[PDB]
Design a binder for this molecule. Structure first.
Ligand SMILES: [Zn+2]
Ligand SMILES: [Zn+2]
Ligand SMILES: [Zn+2]
Ligand SMILES: [Zn+2]
Lengths: 73, 79
DNA sequence: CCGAGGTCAATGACCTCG
DNA sequence: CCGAGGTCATTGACCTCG
C-alpha cells in the first residue's frame, strides 16, 4: 500500500501536488487559508508520524512544504 | 505526566475509571458509555492500539479498555 | 492530591462537485 | 476517475470542584 509522505499514514491519493492522507490534506488546507503561524515547544525537530502530527503543528506544516505541497489555490 | 496509559501507552496523569489512561482514552471510554455506542471492527478484531494508531478501529480500542479493567459503572450520569 | 465532572478548537473521516 | 472543495461528528488538551 501507498503511504502519506508527510506522516506515514495510509495515503488517499495526491493532494496539492503530494501523495498525502486525508489528515494531512485537511491540515494543509486549513493552514494556508488561515495564514497560521505556529510555535514548536520541542525546538523544531519533531519527527513526524501519526502521533506527532496532532502534537506539533509547526513541524507538520514544515514537513508538508518540504514534501512539495503547493499552495496556488 | 508521570504514568503510562494502559491502552495506548501515552502519558497518563492518573487513574480514570480505575485504570491508568491518557486524556484521549479517558474521554473515549466516557463517550462510549454515556451514549451507549456500538462499534464494528473492519478487520479480524485484532487492530493494534498504540500511541499513533489508537484512532484506527473504534471497536478494538473499546475492547482493550474493557480488557484493561475499565469499569463501565464508574461513568456517572450526565448532570 | 486524586478522580469525577465539563468545555471546545482542532482534527479527520466522508461528503458533493466540476 | 481524480482532486478540488466542503460539512461535521469525533478527538483530546485544558478546565472546575469536592
Ligand atoms: Zn499524512
Ligand atoms: Zn516540533
Ligand atoms: Zn491512551
Ligand atoms: Zn478492529
Amino acid at each position: 500500500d501507498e503511504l502519506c509522505v508527510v506522516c506515514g499514514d495510509r495515503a488517499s491519493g495526491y493532494h496539492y501536488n503530494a501523495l498525502t492522507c486525508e489528515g494531512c490534506k485537511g491540515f494543509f488546507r486549513r493552514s494556508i487559508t488561515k495564514n497560521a503561524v505556529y510555535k514548536c515547544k520541542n525546538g523544531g525537530n519533531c519527527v513526524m508520524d501519526m502521533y506527532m502530527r496532532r502534537k506539533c503543528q509547526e513541524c507538520r506544516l514544515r514537513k508538508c512544504k518540504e514534501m512539495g505541497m503547493l499552495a496556488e489555490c | 505526566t508521570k504514568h503510562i496509559c494502559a491502552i495506548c501507552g501515552d502519558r497518563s496523569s492518573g487513574k480514570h475509571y480505575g485504570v491508568y489512561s491518557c486524556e484521549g482514552c479517558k474521554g473515549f471510554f466516557k463517550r462510549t458509555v454515556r451514549k451507549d455506542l456500538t462499534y464494528t471492527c473492519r478487520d479480524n478484531k485484532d487492530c493494534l492500539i498504540d500511541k499513533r494508531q489508537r484512532n484506527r478501529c473504534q471497536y478494538c480500542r473499546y475492547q482493550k479498555c474493557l480488557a484493561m479493567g475499565m469499569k463501565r459503572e464508574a461513568v456517572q450520569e450526565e448532570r
